[PDB]
Write an enzyme that holds these catalytic residues in place. Structure first.
Site, PDB file in Angstrom:
ATOM      1  N   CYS A  71       0.828  -1.208   0.000  1.00 14.60           N
ATOM      2  CA  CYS A  71       0.000   0.000   0.000  1.00 14.60           C
ATOM      3  C   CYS A  71       0.865   1.262   0.000  1.00 14.60           C
ATOM      4  O   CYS A  71       1.594   1.537   0.959  1.00 14.60           O
ATOM      5  CB  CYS A  71      -0.962   0.023   1.194  1.00 14.60           C
TER       6      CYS A  71
ATOM      7  N   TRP B 198      -9.256   6.268  -0.719  1.00 13.65           N
ATOM      8  CA  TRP B 198      -9.551   6.990  -1.942  1.00 13.65           C
ATOM      9  C   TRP B 198      -8.543   6.563  -3.012  1.00 13.65           C
ATOM     10  O   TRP B 198      -7.496   5.966  -2.717  1.00 13.65           O
ATOM     11  CB  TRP B 198      -9.533   8.515  -1.738  1.00 13.65           C
TER      12      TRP B 198
ATOM     13  N   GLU C 178      -4.822   3.728 -10.767  1.00 14.03           N
ATOM     14  CA  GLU C 178      -5.613   2.519 -10.571  1.00 14.03           C
ATOM     15  C   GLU C 178      -6.744   2.455 -11.588  1.00 14.03           C
ATOM     16  O   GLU C 178      -6.997   1.401 -12.192  1.00 14.03           O
ATOM     17  CB  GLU C 178      -6.174   2.477  -9.141  1.00 14.03           C
TER      18      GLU C 178
ATOM     19  N   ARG D  66      -0.037   4.644   2.918  1.00 13.93           N
ATOM     20  CA  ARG D  66       0.026   4.400   4.356  1.00 13.93           C
ATOM     21  C   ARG D  66       0.401   5.618   5.193  1.00 13.93           C
ATOM     22  O   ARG D  66       0.321   5.536   6.430  1.00 13.93           O
ATOM     23  CB  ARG D  66       0.986   3.243   4.629  1.00 13.93           C
TER      24      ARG D  66
HETATM   25  C1  HEM Z   1      -6.334   6.555   2.002  1.00 13.85           C
HETATM   26  C2  HEM Z   1      -6.054   6.414   0.706  1.00 13.85           C
HETATM   27  C3  HEM Z   1      -5.381   5.128   0.151  1.00 13.85           C
HETATM   28  C4  HEM Z   1      -4.668   5.125  -0.977  1.00 13.85           C
HETATM   29  C5  HEM Z   1      -4.375   6.378  -1.830  1.00 13.85           C
HETATM   30  C6  HEM Z   1      -4.206   3.777  -1.216  1.00 13.85           C
HETATM   31  C7  HEM Z   1      -3.430   3.353  -2.268  1.00 13.85           C
HETATM   32  C8  HEM Z   1      -3.305   2.032  -2.634  1.00 13.85           C
HETATM   33  C9  HEM Z   1      -2.958   1.527  -3.942  1.00 13.85           C
HETATM   34  C10 HEM Z   1      -2.711   2.397  -5.179  1.00 13.85           C
HETATM   35  C11 HEM Z   1      -2.927   0.195  -3.872  1.00 13.85           C
HETATM   36  C12 HEM Z   1      -2.647  -0.784  -5.018  1.00 13.85           C
HETATM   37  C13 HEM Z   1      -4.011  -1.299  -5.481  1.00 13.85           C
HETATM   38  C14 HEM Z   1      -3.853  -2.212  -6.671  1.00 13.85           C
HETATM   39  O1  HEM Z   1      -2.919  -1.964  -7.485  1.00 13.85           O
HETATM   40  O2  HEM Z   1      -4.662  -3.174  -6.809  1.00 13.85           O
HETATM   41  C15 HEM Z   1      -3.238  -0.205  -2.518  1.00 13.85           C
HETATM   42  C16 HEM Z   1      -3.285  -1.496  -2.046  1.00 13.85           C
HETATM   43  C17 HEM Z   1      -3.603  -1.862  -0.761  1.00 13.85           C
HETATM   44  N1  HEM Z   1      -4.106  -1.006   0.214  1.00 13.85           N
HETATM   45 FE1  HEM Z   1      -4.072   0.987   0.158  1.00 13.85          FE
HETATM   46  N2  HEM Z   1      -4.682   2.956  -0.198  1.00 13.85           N
HETATM   47  C18 HEM Z   1      -5.427   3.760   0.656  1.00 13.85           C
HETATM   48  C19 HEM Z   1      -6.086   3.305   1.782  1.00 13.85           C
HETATM   49  C20 HEM Z   1      -6.013   2.045   2.332  1.00 13.85           C
HETATM   50  C21 HEM Z   1      -6.694   1.584   3.527  1.00 13.85           C
HETATM   51  C22 HEM Z   1      -7.672   2.460   4.354  1.00 13.85           C
HETATM   52  C23 HEM Z   1      -6.353   0.295   3.739  1.00 13.85           C
HETATM   53  C24 HEM Z   1      -6.776  -0.693   4.859  1.00 13.85           C
HETATM   54  C25 HEM Z   1      -7.547  -0.376   5.912  1.00 13.85           C
HETATM   55  C26 HEM Z   1      -5.428  -0.092   2.673  1.00 13.85           C
HETATM   56  C27 HEM Z   1      -4.831  -1.322   2.533  1.00 13.85           C
HETATM   57  C28 HEM Z   1      -4.324  -1.780   1.345  1.00 13.85           C
HETATM   58  C29 HEM Z   1      -3.957  -3.144   1.051  1.00 13.85           C
HETATM   59  C30 HEM Z   1      -4.040  -4.330   2.031  1.00 13.85           C
HETATM   60  C31 HEM Z   1      -3.516  -3.189  -0.209  1.00 13.85           C
HETATM   61  C32 HEM Z   1      -3.035  -4.449  -0.950  1.00 13.85           C
HETATM   62  C33 HEM Z   1      -4.235  -5.013  -1.703  1.00 13.85           C
HETATM   63  C34 HEM Z   1      -3.834  -6.218  -2.533  1.00 13.85           C
HETATM   64  O3  HEM Z   1      -2.780  -6.866  -2.249  1.00 13.85           O
HETATM   65  O4  HEM Z   1      -4.591  -6.532  -3.492  1.00 13.85           O
HETATM   66  N3  HEM Z   1      -5.246   0.996   1.855  1.00 13.85           N
HETATM   67  N4  HEM Z   1      -3.450   0.947  -1.792  1.00 13.85           N
HETATM   68  C1  LIG Z   2      -7.334  -5.291  -6.322  1.00 15.83           C
HETATM   69  N1  LIG Z   2      -7.003  -4.194  -5.390  1.00 15.83           N
HETATM   70  C2  LIG Z   2      -7.907  -3.081  -5.697  1.00 15.83           C
HETATM   71  C3  LIG Z   2      -7.655  -1.941  -4.808  1.00 15.83           C
HETATM   72  C4  LIG Z   2      -7.507  -1.061  -4.027  1.00 15.83           C
HETATM   73  C5  LIG Z   2      -7.464  -0.045  -3.235  1.00 15.83           C
HETATM   74  C6  LIG Z   2      -7.893  -0.189  -1.908  1.00 15.83           C
HETATM   75  C7  LIG Z   2      -7.899   0.911  -1.058  1.00 15.83           C
HETATM   76  C8  LIG Z   2      -8.348   0.744   0.376  1.00 15.83           C
HETATM   77  C9  LIG Z   2      -7.513   2.138  -1.561  1.00 15.83           C
HETATM   78  C10 LIG Z   2      -7.104   2.229  -2.895  1.00 15.83           C
HETATM   79  N2  LIG Z   2      -6.718   3.413  -3.390  1.00 15.83           N
HETATM   80  N3  LIG Z   2      -7.103   1.163  -3.701  1.00 15.83           N
END
Ligand code: HEM
Ligand SMILES: CNCC#Cc1cc(C)cc(N)n1
Ligand code: HEM
Ligand SMILES: C[C@H](O)[C@H](O)[C@H]1CNc2nc(N)[nH]c(=O)c2N1
Ligand SMILES: C[C@H](O)[C@H](O)[C@H]1CNc2nc(N)[nH]c(=O)c2N1
Ligand SMILES: CNCC#Cc1cc(C)cc(N)n1
Ligand SMILES: [Zn+2]
Lengths: 421, 413
Positions: B109, B281, B286, B112
């Site tokens: 992520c 968000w 994405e 973070r």
């Molecule tokens: C607040 C704004 C956030 C942004 C801008 C963001 C950004 C991202 C992005 C760009 C990805 C890659 C998604 C993909 O390529 O499929 C990602 C993955 C991930 N995010 Fe974040 N995220 C946010 C919030 C969160 C929150 C609130 C959580 C958990 C409570 C979280 C947990 C994760 C996890 C676990 C992944 C890995 C998902 C996977 O392996 O498929 N994120 N995030």
């Molecule tokens: C297959 N993963 C899709 C996704 C995603 C994702 C999840 C969160 C919490 C934020 C973000 N910006 N993106």
């Protein structure tokens, strides 16, 4: 070395099954608990110790490579194989080292290329011109060999892959080294105000060259001299004849104003600071050259912040909203720059490959290697191009990285470890 | 030990000690790196208590109460429940702490820097799919906030015997349906074809359009899952237009504002929360790179390049690269114009570096997956490309789990 590992392509759902990793020799840097896939130099695991190793230290490595070579050519156990082992044994017994046959040298160099996990261009691996330069004794003779390499490899624009292999390391005090990181690069000059003229990556090397007597013209694109060290001696400056240095002026198919930026690049990428390891033998001077993937120039060389850093100048002439990052003005200019680079090389009939073609070929090469060899070590962090990653097929290709020998390795910059005479 | 990571653009070097406190494997070995592999490979009473003790210890350490009377009684109290019931229940404080730290530990992520501003909705009292729907509706409304998006997570009851799991069968709370046509083409989102078929089989009546918001398929207590339509007024969507290309709106593209991942598992102190949808968000790429331009997704490059009058005959014209940028311009422009929170890949990666540096200073490190952190376009012009990173697994964590239709044994005869 787990027993048999699969990799999946998430676009095509093709699965490959890897068993070649069982032949992996040295550590990746990773463990079961931590992954160092994005560390530039994760490991110092070397196959032989510091300098002149004892016989029980060098012979096992020789035995392996000779075994591998005679295995490769349908022998193993043959008369010639058993004779070669006894020969290597006696050679180490009387000189603490041994000398490769020409066949083994060609085999070793080609397989170091085939084993280079960070190279997307390895579909070509078996088409490599090997120049044996192990009879070289002076920096002048090194300059002669490199001039011949550059001329053969450039071939008036129809580039040909080549490597020139200088004498192997012996006791560590008589190293042959090309001090240049590439045979052809541009100088960088610290400006009085504080900015940099030319290539900032080359500021230190440029100062060494000036300090050794080079007379800098002090432009943005000054071809650096060669700084060549033979047999551990102080290195010597040589100006490559400019008629040997093919260059491409960068222009754009639609933007007439682009040529007025006065950008150019050179045609021949020729990495000269790495080390070639074959059967325990270390070749510290081994310049090798191929042809460019356009992004190496258009993305990294031109647009890295600590390189030529030309994005803002291009975006200005494009009349782009540079107020905020979300206008993607950097991304727009990047594409135009890489269009111009490819257009320019192609217009001048200088070999170049775009990142779509290069990566597609690597997928095909991967499939060939799993078919015939049972695997292909590949560094995703390096194979995936620095622009438009996920619209190339390698982004969606799982890869396994492992270290096989013969290999190309990094080595310290010679000015950190050279006592001048 | 210590481990150095270097930034090759700035020359800054950071020192990782946090990695010494990791436990599950990465998938790599001493001789193979599996860093590009997507998925590398119920607890008994004995297994559970060391995991619980570890979590309770780090919780009480985090709040500067390690060794305290409250710490030691909590450990004893957890130990009694594991002895009695074969499991234990988290305090609300621990639940909130654990959910924030699973986000903080998500190596994939890039967002973070926001980890500690997470709204946690405790739904451990839920018993039916109707209740799940109610919780999820409330989550969507809170998180969406009329476009001023707020990070949130809703946590449903933990796994017990593995026969009574709570599951959201959707991979995200809001996704678009996909329908395979007899001629082999696909309408809508090809990634969601199989899940759309499941919904139709369960009773859903599809409008059969290009952007049909899917229904929720929700499973409580290991019972068969049930269909629910999210109220349309809660689904915020953004029609995609371009600041310079008037024709761009004629593509008819839109996307939803709320990315809400709903098929992962939240592990806290050995407890497994199999239904735990979380939302934040979007980063623009994405949508504009993967959702729109993956060959297996909406695959709009050729259509967009057509309208740009690009020479599509040869690859070296970089027509795909040229079309990719404009599409990503349009996505960001459209969200910003409609005042729907989004972040572009340059801002997002710059913040992550600041976060990563901060985390090394205060925590001793920051596990990070370069393969996922680096955005899918313009890689080396973002700062993270030049950032060395170390990847390792800390708990609490978000994990993958098998799709429920592969494991669920249907009751409904
Ligand atoms: C607040 C704004 C956030 C942004 C801008 C963001 C950004 C991202 C992005 C760009 C990805 C890659 C998604 C993909 O390529 O499929 C990602 C993955 C991930 N995010 Fe974040 N995220 C946010 C919030 C969160 C929150 C609130 C959580 C958990 C409570 C979280 C947990 C994760 C996890 C676990 C992944 C890995 C998902 C996977 O392996 O498929 N994120 N995030
Ligand atoms: C297959 N993963 C899709 C996704 C995603 C994702 C999840 C969160 C919490 C934020 C973000 N910006 N993106
Ligand atoms: C013939 C066309 C070739 C192409 C298109 C090609 C392509 C590339 C590219 C794009 C890189 C990454 C460059 C960077 O980002 O620094 C690379 C690295 C590398 N290439 Fe190839 N290459 C070719 C030929 C060769 C040959 C002939 C050899 C050796 C015999 C070789 C060995 C290597 C090695 C060792 C690296 C890693 C360099 C490092 O770690 O810094 N390549 N190649
Ligand atoms: C830190 C990171 O590993 C580093 O920036 C790498 C990433 N991938 C790369 N890939 C290539 N081809 N060349 C590079 O120099 C790099 N640099
Ligand atoms: C094979 C490879 O690991 C796979 O394509 C990864 C690469 N990096 C990614 N990065 C992000 N953010 N999201 C992804 O789905 C992927 N997919
Ligand atoms: C920092 N490495 C620079 C480089 C390079 C390179 C080397 C070769 C043989 C081919 C190529 N296309 N590029
Ligand atoms: Zn690894």
């Amino acid at each position: 070395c787990p027993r048999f590992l699969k990799v999946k392509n998430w676009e095509t759902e093709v699965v490959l099954t890897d068993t070649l990793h069982l032949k992996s020799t040295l550590e990746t840097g990773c463990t079961e608990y931590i992954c160092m896939g994005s560390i530039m130099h994760p490991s110092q695991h070397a196959r032989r110790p510091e300098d002149v190793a004892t016989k029980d230290q060098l012979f096992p490595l020789a035995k392996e490579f000779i075994d591998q070579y005679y295995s490769s050519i349908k022998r193993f156990g043959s008369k010639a194989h058993m004779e070669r082992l006894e020969e290597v044994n006696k050679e180490i017994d009387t000189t603490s080292t041994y000398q490769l046959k020409d066949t083994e040298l060609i085999y070793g160099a080609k397989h170091a290329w085939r084993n280079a996990s960070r190279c997307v261009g390895r579909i070509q691996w078996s088409k490599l011109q090997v120049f044996d330069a192990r009879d070289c004794t002076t920096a002048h003779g090194m300059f002669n060999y490199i001039c011949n390499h550059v001329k053969y490899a450039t071939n008036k624009g129809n580039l040909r892959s080549a490597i020139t292999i200088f004498p192997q390391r012996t006791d560590g005090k008589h190293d042959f080294r090309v001090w240049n990181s590439q045979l052809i690069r541009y100088a960088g000059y610290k400006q009085p105000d504080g900015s940099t003229l030319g290539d900032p990556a080359n500021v230190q090397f440029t100062e060494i060259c000036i300090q050794q007597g080079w007379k800098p013209p002090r432009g943005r694109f000054d071809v650096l001299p060669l700084l060549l060290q033979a047999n551990g001696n102080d290195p010597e400056l040589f100006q490559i004849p400019p008629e040997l240095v093919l260059e491409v002026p960068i222009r754009h198919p639609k933007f007439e104003w682009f040529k007025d930026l006065g950008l150019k690049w050179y045609g021949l990428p020729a990495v000269s600071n790495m080390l070639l390891e074959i059967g325990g033998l270390e070749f510290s001077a081994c310049p090798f050259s191929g042809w460019y993937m356009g992004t190496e120039i258009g993305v990294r060389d031109y647009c890295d912040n600590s390189r030529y850093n030309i994005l803002e100048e291009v975006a200005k002439k494009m009349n782009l909203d540079m107020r905020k990052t979300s206008s993607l003005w950097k991304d727009q200019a990047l594409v135009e720059i890489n269009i111009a680079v490819l257009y320019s090389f192609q217009s001048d009939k200088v070999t170049i490959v775009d990142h779509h073609s290069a990566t597609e070929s690597f997928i095909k090469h991967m499939e060939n290697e799993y078919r015939c060899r049972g695997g292909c070590p590949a560094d995703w962090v390096w194979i995936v191009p620095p622009m438009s990653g996920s619209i190339t097929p390698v982004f969606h290709q799982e890869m396994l990285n492992y270290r096989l020998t013969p290999s190309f390795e990094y080595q310290p910059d010679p000015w950190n470890t050279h006592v001048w005479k």
